[PDB]
Coordinates of C-alpha atoms and ligand atoms in Angstrom, one line a residue:
Chain A
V2 CA 131.2 70.4 -9.8
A3 CA 130.9 74.2 -11.4
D4 CA 127.5 74.2 -12.3
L5 CA 126.5 72.9 -8.9
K6 CA 128.4 75.6 -6.9
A7 CA 126.3 77.9 -8.7
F8 CA 122.8 76.1 -8.4
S9 CA 123.3 75.7 -4.7
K10 CA 124.1 79.6 -4.2
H11 CA 121.1 80.3 -6.0
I12 CA 118.9 78.1 -4.0
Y13 CA 120.5 79.5 -0.6
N14 CA 119.2 82.8 -1.9
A15 CA 115.8 81.8 -2.5
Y16 CA 115.7 80.0 0.9
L17 CA 117.2 83.4 2.5
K18 CA 114.6 85.6 0.5
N19 CA 111.6 83.5 1.4
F20 CA 111.8 82.1 5.2
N21 CA 111.1 84.6 7.7
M22 CA 112.9 82.4 10.3
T23 CA 116.5 80.8 9.6
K24 CA 118.4 78.3 11.7
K25 CA 121.1 80.8 12.3
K26 CA 118.4 83.5 13.5
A27 CA 116.8 80.7 15.5
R28 CA 120.0 79.5 17.4
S29 CA 121.0 82.8 18.2
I30 CA 117.5 83.6 20.0
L31 CA 117.7 80.3 21.6
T32 CA 121.0 81.0 23.1
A39 CA 114.6 87.2 25.3
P40 CA 111.5 85.4 23.9
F41 CA 108.5 85.1 26.3
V42 CA 108.0 81.6 27.8
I43 CA 104.8 80.0 27.2
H44 CA 104.3 76.9 29.6
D45 CA 100.9 77.1 30.9
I46 CA 97.3 78.7 30.5
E47 CA 98.1 82.1 32.6
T48 CA 101.2 82.7 30.3
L49 CA 99.3 81.6 27.2
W50 CA 96.5 84.0 28.0
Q51 CA 99.3 86.9 28.6
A52 CA 101.1 86.0 25.4
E53 CA 97.7 86.6 23.5
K54 CA 96.9 89.8 25.3
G55 CA 100.0 91.6 23.7
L56 CA 103.2 89.9 25.1
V57 CA 103.4 87.7 22.0
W58 CA 100.6 88.4 19.5
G64 CA 91.9 86.6 12.8
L65 CA 91.0 83.2 14.5
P66 CA 88.2 80.8 14.6
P67 CA 85.7 81.2 17.7
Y68 CA 87.3 80.3 21.2
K69 CA 86.5 76.9 22.0
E70 CA 88.9 75.5 24.7
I71 CA 92.7 75.5 25.4
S72 CA 94.0 72.5 23.4
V73 CA 91.8 73.5 20.8
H74 CA 93.1 77.2 20.5
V75 CA 96.8 75.6 20.3
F76 CA 95.6 73.3 17.7
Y77 CA 94.5 76.6 15.7
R78 CA 97.7 78.5 16.0
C79 CA 99.5 75.5 14.8
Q80 CA 97.0 75.4 11.6
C81 CA 97.9 79.0 11.3
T82 CA 101.8 78.6 11.2
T83 CA 101.5 75.5 8.9
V84 CA 99.6 77.8 6.4
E85 CA 101.8 80.7 6.8
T86 CA 104.9 78.3 6.1
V87 CA 103.0 76.6 3.0
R88 CA 103.1 80.3 1.5
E89 CA 106.7 80.7 2.2
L90 CA 107.4 77.3 1.0
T91 CA 105.5 78.2 -2.3
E92 CA 107.3 81.2 -2.7
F93 CA 110.5 79.3 -2.1
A94 CA 110.1 76.5 -4.8
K95 CA 108.6 79.2 -7.4
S96 CA 112.0 81.1 -6.8
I97 CA 113.8 77.9 -8.2
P98 CA 113.8 78.4 -12.2
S99 CA 113.6 74.8 -13.0
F100 CA 110.6 74.5 -10.7
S101 CA 108.8 77.5 -12.2
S102 CA 109.2 75.9 -15.8
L103 CA 106.9 72.9 -14.6
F104 CA 103.3 73.0 -15.8
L105 CA 101.3 74.9 -12.9
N106 CA 99.3 71.5 -12.1
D107 CA 102.6 69.7 -11.4
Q108 CA 103.7 72.4 -9.4
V109 CA 100.8 72.0 -7.1
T110 CA 101.3 68.2 -6.9
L111 CA 104.8 68.6 -5.6
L112 CA 103.9 71.3 -3.1
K113 CA 100.7 69.3 -2.2
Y114 CA 103.0 66.3 -0.9
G115 CA 106.0 67.7 -0.3
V116 CA 104.7 70.6 2.1
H117 CA 104.4 68.7 5.5
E118 CA 107.7 67.0 5.0
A119 CA 109.6 70.1 4.4
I120 CA 107.6 71.8 7.5
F121 CA 108.7 69.0 9.8
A122 CA 112.2 69.4 8.4
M123 CA 112.4 73.0 9.1
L124 CA 110.7 72.7 12.6
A125 CA 114.0 71.3 14.0
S126 CA 115.4 74.9 13.2
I127 CA 113.1 76.5 15.9
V128 CA 113.3 73.7 18.2
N129 CA 115.3 72.5 21.5
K130 CA 115.0 69.6 24.0
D131 CA 112.7 71.8 25.9
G132 CA 110.3 73.6 23.4
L133 CA 109.7 75.6 20.2
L134 CA 110.2 79.3 19.2
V135 CA 106.8 80.8 18.0
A136 CA 105.5 83.8 16.4
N137 CA 108.6 84.8 14.7
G138 CA 111.0 84.5 17.8
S139 CA 108.7 86.5 20.1
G140 CA 107.5 83.5 22.0
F141 CA 108.6 80.0 23.4
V142 CA 106.3 77.6 23.9
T143 CA 107.4 74.5 26.4
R144 CA 107.3 70.8 25.1
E145 CA 106.1 70.1 28.6
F146 CA 102.9 72.3 27.9
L147 CA 102.2 70.5 24.8
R148 CA 102.0 67.4 26.4
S149 CA 99.6 68.8 29.0
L150 CA 97.1 69.8 26.4
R151 CA 94.2 66.9 26.2
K152 CA 93.9 64.2 23.8
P153 CA 94.5 63.8 20.7
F154 CA 95.8 67.2 20.7
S155 CA 99.0 66.3 22.8
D156 CA 99.7 63.3 20.5
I157 CA 100.1 65.6 17.4
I158 CA 103.3 67.6 18.1
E159 CA 105.0 65.0 20.5
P160 CA 106.6 62.9 17.5
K161 CA 107.8 66.0 15.7
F162 CA 109.7 66.7 18.7
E163 CA 111.1 63.3 18.6
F164 CA 112.2 63.7 15.2
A165 CA 113.7 67.4 15.5
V166 CA 116.1 66.2 18.3
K167 CA 117.6 63.4 16.4
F168 CA 117.7 65.7 13.2
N169 CA 119.4 68.6 14.7
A170 CA 122.1 66.3 15.8
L171 CA 123.3 66.3 12.1
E172 CA 124.5 70.0 12.6
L173 CA 123.2 71.4 9.4
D174 CA 123.3 75.1 8.6
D175 CA 121.0 77.1 6.5
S176 CA 122.7 76.3 3.1
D177 CA 122.3 72.7 3.9
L178 CA 118.9 72.9 4.6
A179 CA 118.1 75.1 1.6
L180 CA 119.1 72.3 -0.8
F181 CA 117.7 69.6 1.6
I182 CA 114.2 71.3 1.4
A183 CA 114.3 71.8 -2.3
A184 CA 115.0 67.9 -2.7
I185 CA 112.3 66.9 -0.4
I186 CA 109.7 69.3 -2.8
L187 CA 111.3 68.4 -6.1
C188 CA 110.7 64.9 -5.7
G189 CA 109.4 62.7 -8.7
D190 CA 107.8 59.8 -6.7
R191 CA 104.6 62.0 -6.1
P192 CA 101.2 60.3 -6.9
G193 CA 99.4 62.1 -10.1
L194 CA 102.8 63.6 -11.2
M195 CA 102.4 64.5 -15.0
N196 CA 105.8 64.8 -16.2
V197 CA 107.9 62.5 -14.2
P198 CA 111.1 62.0 -16.0
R199 CA 111.7 65.9 -15.9
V200 CA 110.9 66.3 -12.4
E201 CA 113.3 63.2 -11.5
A202 CA 116.1 64.8 -13.6
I203 CA 115.7 68.1 -11.5
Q204 CA 115.9 66.1 -8.3
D205 CA 119.2 64.2 -9.5
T206 CA 120.5 67.7 -9.9
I207 CA 119.7 69.1 -6.4
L208 CA 120.7 65.9 -4.7
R209 CA 124.2 65.9 -6.6
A210 CA 124.5 69.5 -5.6
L211 CA 123.5 68.6 -1.8
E212 CA 126.1 65.9 -1.8
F213 CA 128.8 68.3 -3.2
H214 CA 128.0 70.7 -0.9
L215 CA 127.9 68.5 2.2
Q216 CA 131.8 67.8 1.1
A217 CA 132.7 71.4 1.3
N218 CA 130.5 72.8 3.9
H219 CA 131.2 69.7 6.6
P220 CA 134.7 68.0 5.5
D221 CA 135.3 65.8 8.4
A222 CA 131.4 64.6 8.9
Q223 CA 131.1 61.0 7.4
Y224 CA 127.9 59.4 5.9
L225 CA 126.2 62.6 6.2
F226 CA 124.8 62.5 2.7
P227 CA 123.1 58.9 3.1
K228 CA 122.3 59.8 6.6
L229 CA 120.2 62.6 5.2
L230 CA 118.4 60.3 2.5
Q231 CA 117.3 58.2 5.2
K232 CA 115.8 61.3 7.0
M233 CA 113.7 61.6 3.9
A234 CA 112.3 58.3 4.3
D235 CA 111.7 59.0 8.0
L236 CA 110.0 62.4 6.9
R237 CA 107.4 60.0 5.0
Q238 CA 106.5 58.0 7.7
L239 CA 106.1 61.0 9.8
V240 CA 103.4 62.7 7.6
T241 CA 101.6 59.6 6.9
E242 CA 101.1 59.3 10.7
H243 CA 100.3 62.9 10.9
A244 CA 97.6 62.5 8.1
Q245 CA 96.2 59.5 10.1
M246 CA 95.8 61.5 13.3
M247 CA 94.1 64.5 11.6
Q248 CA 91.7 61.9 10.3
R249 CA 91.0 61.1 14.0
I250 CA 90.3 64.6 14.9
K251 CA 88.0 65.0 11.8
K252 CA 86.1 62.1 13.1
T253 CA 86.0 62.3 16.7
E254 CA 86.3 66.2 17.2
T255 CA 83.5 67.4 15.0
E256 CA 83.2 70.6 16.7
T257 CA 86.7 71.4 15.7
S258 CA 87.4 73.0 12.4
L259 CA 90.4 72.5 10.0
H260 CA 91.7 75.1 7.7
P261 CA 90.3 74.2 4.0
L262 CA 94.2 74.2 2.5
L263 CA 95.0 71.7 5.1
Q264 CA 91.7 69.5 4.3
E265 CA 92.7 69.6 0.7
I266 CA 96.1 68.2 1.5
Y267 CA 95.1 65.6 3.9
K268 CA 92.4 64.5 1.4
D269 CA 94.9 61.9 0.5
Chain B
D4 CA 90.3 102.5 -10.1
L5 CA 88.6 101.0 -12.9
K6 CA 90.4 102.7 -15.7
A7 CA 93.8 102.0 -14.0
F8 CA 92.7 98.1 -13.8
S9 CA 91.6 98.0 -17.1
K10 CA 94.9 99.4 -18.8
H11 CA 96.9 96.9 -16.4
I12 CA 94.9 93.8 -17.8
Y13 CA 95.6 95.4 -21.4
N14 CA 99.3 95.0 -20.7
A15 CA 99.0 91.5 -19.3
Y16 CA 97.4 90.7 -22.6
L17 CA 99.9 92.4 -24.9
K18 CA 102.8 91.1 -23.0
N19 CA 101.8 87.5 -23.1
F20 CA 99.8 86.7 -26.3
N21 CA 101.8 86.3 -29.6
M22 CA 98.7 86.8 -31.7
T23 CA 96.7 89.9 -31.2
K24 CA 93.4 90.5 -33.1
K25 CA 94.8 93.7 -34.6
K26 CA 98.0 91.8 -35.6
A27 CA 95.7 89.1 -37.0
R28 CA 93.3 91.5 -38.8
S29 CA 96.0 93.0 -40.5
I30 CA 97.5 89.7 -42.0
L31 CA 93.8 88.6 -42.8
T32 CA 93.6 91.8 -44.9
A39 CA 100.8 86.8 -47.4
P40 CA 100.1 83.7 -45.3
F41 CA 100.5 80.3 -47.4
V42 CA 97.2 78.9 -47.8
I43 CA 96.9 75.2 -46.6
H44 CA 93.8 73.8 -48.4
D45 CA 94.9 70.0 -49.2
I46 CA 97.3 67.3 -48.7
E47 CA 99.9 68.4 -51.1
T48 CA 99.8 72.0 -49.4
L49 CA 99.7 70.7 -46.0
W50 CA 102.9 68.7 -46.9
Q51 CA 104.7 71.7 -48.5
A52 CA 103.5 73.7 -45.2
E53 CA 105.5 71.0 -43.1
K54 CA 108.8 70.9 -45.5
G55 CA 109.6 74.3 -44.6
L56 CA 106.9 76.8 -46.0
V57 CA 105.2 77.3 -42.6
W58 CA 106.9 75.3 -40.2
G64 CA 108.7 67.3 -32.1
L65 CA 105.5 65.5 -32.8
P66 CA 103.9 62.0 -32.2
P67 CA 104.8 59.7 -34.8
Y68 CA 103.0 60.0 -38.3
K69 CA 99.8 58.0 -38.4
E70 CA 97.5 59.7 -40.9
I71 CA 96.4 63.0 -42.1
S72 CA 93.2 63.8 -40.1
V73 CA 95.1 62.7 -37.0
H74 CA 98.1 64.9 -38.0
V75 CA 95.9 67.8 -38.0
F76 CA 94.7 66.5 -34.8
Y77 CA 98.1 66.8 -33.1
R78 CA 98.7 70.2 -34.3
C79 CA 95.6 71.4 -32.9
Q80 CA 96.8 69.7 -29.6
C81 CA 100.3 71.5 -30.0
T82 CA 98.5 74.8 -30.7
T83 CA 96.0 74.4 -27.7
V84 CA 99.2 73.6 -25.3
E85 CA 101.1 76.5 -26.4
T86 CA 98.0 78.8 -25.7
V87 CA 97.5 77.3 -22.3
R88 CA 101.0 78.4 -21.4
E89 CA 100.2 82.1 -22.9
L90 CA 97.1 82.0 -20.8
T91 CA 98.8 81.0 -17.5
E92 CA 101.3 83.7 -17.9
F93 CA 98.5 86.1 -18.6
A94 CA 96.4 85.4 -15.6
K95 CA 99.8 85.3 -13.3
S96 CA 100.3 89.1 -14.7
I97 CA 97.1 90.0 -12.8
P98 CA 98.3 90.8 -9.2
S99 CA 94.7 89.8 -7.6
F100 CA 95.2 86.1 -9.6
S101 CA 98.7 85.8 -8.3
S102 CA 97.4 86.5 -4.6
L103 CA 95.3 83.5 -4.8
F104 CA 96.2 80.0 -3.2
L105 CA 98.3 78.1 -5.9
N106 CA 95.7 75.3 -6.1
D107 CA 92.9 77.7 -6.7
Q108 CA 95.0 79.3 -9.4
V109 CA 95.2 75.8 -11.0
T110 CA 91.3 75.3 -10.6
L111 CA 90.6 78.8 -12.3
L112 CA 92.7 77.8 -15.2
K113 CA 91.7 74.2 -15.6
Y114 CA 88.2 74.9 -16.2
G115 CA 88.8 78.4 -17.9
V116 CA 91.4 78.0 -20.5
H117 CA 89.3 76.1 -23.0
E118 CA 86.5 78.9 -22.9
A119 CA 89.3 81.3 -23.2
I120 CA 90.9 79.6 -26.0
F121 CA 87.5 79.4 -27.9
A122 CA 87.0 83.1 -27.4
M123 CA 90.5 84.1 -28.8
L124 CA 90.0 81.7 -31.7
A125 CA 87.6 84.3 -33.5
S126 CA 90.4 86.8 -33.5
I127 CA 92.5 84.5 -36.1
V128 CA 89.2 83.3 -38.0
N129 CA 87.2 84.7 -40.9
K130 CA 84.4 82.9 -42.7
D131 CA 86.9 80.8 -44.9
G132 CA 89.6 79.3 -42.8
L133 CA 92.1 80.3 -39.7
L134 CA 95.5 81.6 -39.1
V135 CA 98.0 79.0 -38.1
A136 CA 101.7 78.7 -37.0
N137 CA 101.9 82.7 -35.8
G138 CA 100.4 84.1 -39.2
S139 CA 102.7 82.2 -41.4
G140 CA 99.9 79.8 -42.7
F141 CA 96.2 79.8 -43.3
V142 CA 94.3 76.5 -43.1
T143 CA 90.9 76.7 -45.1
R144 CA 87.7 75.8 -43.2
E145 CA 86.7 73.5 -46.2
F146 CA 89.8 71.6 -45.8
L147 CA 89.0 71.0 -42.0
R148 CA 85.7 69.6 -43.0
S149 CA 87.2 67.2 -45.4
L150 CA 89.1 65.6 -42.7
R151 CA 87.4 62.3 -41.7
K152 CA 85.2 61.5 -38.7
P153 CA 85.3 62.2 -35.7
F154 CA 88.0 65.0 -36.6
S155 CA 86.2 67.1 -39.0
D156 CA 83.4 67.5 -36.2
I157 CA 85.8 69.0 -33.6
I158 CA 86.7 72.3 -35.2
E159 CA 83.4 73.0 -37.1
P160 CA 81.3 74.2 -34.0
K161 CA 84.3 76.7 -32.9
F162 CA 84.1 78.1 -36.2
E163 CA 80.2 78.6 -36.0
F164 CA 81.0 80.5 -32.8
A165 CA 83.9 82.4 -34.1
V166 CA 81.6 84.2 -36.9
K167 CA 78.8 85.1 -34.5
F168 CA 81.4 86.3 -31.9
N169 CA 83.4 88.5 -34.5
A170 CA 80.2 90.3 -35.3
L171 CA 80.4 92.0 -32.0
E172 CA 83.5 93.7 -33.5
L173 CA 85.6 93.8 -30.1
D174 CA 89.2 95.0 -29.9
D175 CA 92.1 93.7 -28.0
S176 CA 91.3 95.6 -24.9
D177 CA 87.8 94.5 -24.7
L178 CA 89.0 90.9 -25.3
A179 CA 91.9 91.5 -22.5
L180 CA 89.0 92.1 -19.9
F181 CA 86.6 89.4 -21.3
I182 CA 89.3 86.5 -21.2
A183 CA 90.4 87.8 -17.5
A184 CA 86.5 87.4 -16.6
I185 CA 86.4 84.0 -18.0
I186 CA 89.2 82.8 -15.8
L187 CA 88.4 84.6 -12.8
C188 CA 85.1 82.9 -12.6
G189 CA 83.8 81.9 -9.3
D190 CA 81.5 79.2 -10.2
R191 CA 84.3 76.3 -10.8
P192 CA 84.1 73.4 -9.0
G193 CA 86.6 72.6 -6.1
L194 CA 87.2 76.1 -5.8
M195 CA 88.9 76.7 -2.3
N196 CA 88.2 80.4 -1.6
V197 CA 84.9 81.3 -3.5
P198 CA 84.1 84.8 -2.1
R199 CA 87.5 86.2 -2.8
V200 CA 87.2 84.8 -6.6
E201 CA 83.7 86.3 -6.8
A202 CA 84.9 89.5 -5.4
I203 CA 87.8 89.8 -8.1
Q204 CA 85.1 88.6 -10.8
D205 CA 82.8 91.5 -10.1
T206 CA 85.7 93.8 -10.4
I207 CA 86.5 92.7 -13.5
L208 CA 83.1 92.9 -14.8
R209 CA 82.5 96.2 -13.7
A210 CA 85.7 97.4 -15.4
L211 CA 84.6 95.5 -18.8
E212 CA 81.3 97.3 -18.7
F213 CA 82.8 101.0 -17.9
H214 CA 85.2 99.9 -20.8
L215 CA 82.7 99.2 -23.1
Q216 CA 80.8 102.4 -22.9
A217 CA 84.2 104.5 -23.5
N218 CA 85.2 102.2 -26.4
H219 CA 82.2 101.5 -28.0
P220 CA 80.0 104.5 -27.3
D221 CA 77.1 103.6 -29.9
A222 CA 77.1 99.8 -29.2
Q223 CA 73.7 98.9 -27.3
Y224 CA 73.4 95.8 -25.3
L225 CA 76.9 94.9 -25.8
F226 CA 77.8 94.0 -21.7
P227 CA 74.6 91.8 -21.6
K228 CA 75.5 90.2 -25.0
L229 CA 78.9 89.4 -23.7
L230 CA 77.8 87.8 -20.8
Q231 CA 75.4 85.4 -22.8
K232 CA 78.6 84.6 -24.9
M233 CA 80.2 83.4 -21.5
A234 CA 77.0 80.9 -21.3
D235 CA 77.6 79.7 -24.7
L236 CA 81.4 79.2 -24.3
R237 CA 80.4 76.8 -21.4
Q238 CA 78.1 74.8 -23.8
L239 CA 80.9 74.7 -26.4
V240 CA 83.5 73.4 -23.9
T241 CA 81.0 70.9 -22.7
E242 CA 80.4 69.7 -26.2
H243 CA 84.2 69.5 -26.9
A244 CA 84.7 67.4 -23.7
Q245 CA 82.3 64.8 -24.9
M246 CA 83.8 64.7 -28.1
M247 CA 87.3 64.0 -27.1
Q248 CA 85.8 61.0 -25.0
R249 CA 84.8 59.7 -28.1
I250 CA 88.0 59.6 -29.8
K251 CA 89.7 58.3 -26.4
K252 CA 87.4 55.7 -26.6
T253 CA 86.9 54.9 -30.4
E254 CA 90.3 56.2 -31.8
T255 CA 92.4 54.3 -29.1
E256 CA 95.5 54.5 -31.7
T257 CA 95.5 58.3 -31.2
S258 CA 97.2 60.0 -28.3
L259 CA 96.2 62.9 -26.3
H260 CA 98.7 65.1 -24.5
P261 CA 98.7 64.4 -20.8
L262 CA 98.0 68.2 -19.8
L263 CA 94.6 68.0 -22.0
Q264 CA 93.9 64.5 -20.7
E265 CA 93.9 66.1 -17.0
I266 CA 91.5 69.1 -18.1
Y267 CA 88.8 66.8 -19.6
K268 CA 88.9 64.6 -16.9
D269 CA 86.6 65.8 -14.3
Ligands
LIG1 O1 103.9 73.9 18.4 C1 103.4 74.7 17.5 N1 102.8 76.0 17.3 C2 102.5 76.4 18.5 C3 102.3 76.2 19.4 C4 101.8 76.5 20.6 C5 101.3 77.6 20.5 C6 101.4 78.5 19.7 C7 101.9 77.8 18.2 C8 102.2 78.6 17.2 O2 102.9 78.1 16.2 O3 101.3 79.4 17.0 C9 104.2 74.1 15.9 C10 104.7 75.0 15.0 C11 105.1 74.7 14.0 C12 104.9 73.4 13.5 C13 104.3 72.5 14.5 S1 104.0 70.7 13.9 O4 104.0 70.1 15.3 O5 105.2 70.4 12.9 N2 102.7 71.1 13.1 C14 102.8 71.1 11.8 C15 101.6 70.5 10.9 C16 100.2 70.4 11.5 C17 99.2 70.7 11.0 C18 97.9 71.1 11.5 C19 97.9 71.0 12.9 C20 99.0 70.9 13.8 C21 100.2 70.8 12.9 C22 101.5 70.5 13.8 C23 103.8 72.6 15.6
LIG2 O1 92.4 74.5 -36.7 C1 93.4 74.5 -35.8 N1 94.6 74.0 -35.9 C2 95.2 73.7 -37.0 C3 94.5 73.0 -37.8 C4 95.4 72.5 -39.3 C5 96.6 72.6 -39.2 C6 97.2 73.3 -38.3 C7 96.6 73.7 -37.1 C8 97.5 74.4 -36.0 O2 96.7 74.9 -34.9 O3 98.8 74.3 -36.3 C9 92.9 75.2 -34.6 C10 93.8 76.0 -33.9 C11 93.7 76.5 -32.6 C12 92.4 76.2 -32.1 C13 91.7 75.2 -32.7 S1 90.1 74.7 -31.7 O4 89.2 74.2 -32.6 O5 89.6 75.9 -31.1 N2 90.8 73.4 -30.8 C14 91.1 73.8 -29.4 C15 90.9 72.7 -28.3 C16 91.5 71.4 -29.0 C17 92.1 70.4 -28.3 C18 92.6 69.4 -28.9 C19 92.1 69.2 -30.3 C20 91.6 69.9 -30.9 C21 90.9 71.1 -30.6 C22 90.3 72.0 -31.0 C23 91.9 74.8 -33.7

């Protein structure tokens, strides 16, 4: 219980040091950003009011490129976050990459819930708010990509986790010993079990009255697996049917499996 | 900007490697001499030094080479990370560079702990004789011999630690590695290292002609060396099935 109070605080610092957008910062904004709800307001957002990119093609593809850019920026933040966990950094560099490779999207979808409400999501570091309605209005198969992440984000936010809960949840997602090609599995498993025990102790103190919060959270991790799988499946469809669209090499690398 | 860069790398080098060429040369000019089974046994029992379960002598030496190789991969990983431009690459690119670079780097650094007669082991405490390494049974005797051949020809160039620092950095930040994600960037960093190395060789070795191009040729030689090493490790994995290879080395010899 004592080594676990310490551990949790250490991770919460790695979290606060490395992510530009916390749930605390986001909730206070969501309760002014510039609302992007159509082409005119998107054009206005670009021209200064909110914001290099691959050459212009069309609006649904443009949004698709901005999602990729945001995804990459978050992979960096997550990379720096993980490295800030001493036990992570003491793994072999090839194992670090394996964990990140299979972990990042699950983590990204987990953190998305922080910047989301029923109506849309905060973009460009809180400067803008893209409406969910506008994202459904994009042509197929681009409209299909973001919609399930929303569905998930609403159900997730109902658990009312704060940044210190998320810190440990994210760390658990990344330091997960079931990843294929993992070199030193027992070690990764050991570190995970510590994170999970820490998370669980932390949930008791931080949420005294919330029942079943820990097992519900574990189920959320299973859900994120299904989410990422379904994401990968859709990116295959874009790579095949939308050959004119281009995918950032780092995402190509991740989606490869 | 190149005087600065070189000094920065020389610090990463001195901070990260336990055995420099200066430290080695002064020892090689007392370590405990391992030249046979009795002196190997004596070296183990305290006089010099977990491992995989005992099998036989040629395999034991083979396990100690693996252990040393792994420890150096760590030192090299920390060394490279100590280059800001390296650390600013994507983590998957860092791993690619290290994957294909380390063995070339290891064989380059080996020359520092080697003379005609043998090599310094266990952080300078011991000296294993070349003769004893030839005396090991096949295919284990074949593994180390070419690295020696290379190390003698290499030491003739009389490089100091500050030359090696930049040479190693060049070996690692090499943009010709397969599966490299951001090639132009890696190439840009390399060219800086190579320009630095070249400027540094003029100042550090005013009279040595053709030292820079000869060094470039040494990098091509190391490629051939590593290729031939990989080929031999395939033979041990296939014919010596009872022998075990460290998982990290299994990863590197794969592709
Ligand atoms: O909707 C989003 N962003 C935007 C939407 C509209 C306009 C601008 C942006 C932006 O973030 O710049 C948005 C943000 C964060 C996350 C997401 S997502 O739906 O979780 N995302 C992550 C993985 C991924 C990988 C490849 C392609 C698309 C995606 C989609 C969307
Ligand atoms: O000769 C050496 N080591 C020893 C030999 C005898 C006894 C002890 C040691 C020791 O290093 O402790 C030795 C040291 C450092 C390097 C080398 S090596 O020949 O460059 N080495 C590196 C790659 C590799 C990978 C897998 C298997 C073998 C090898 C061969 C040998």
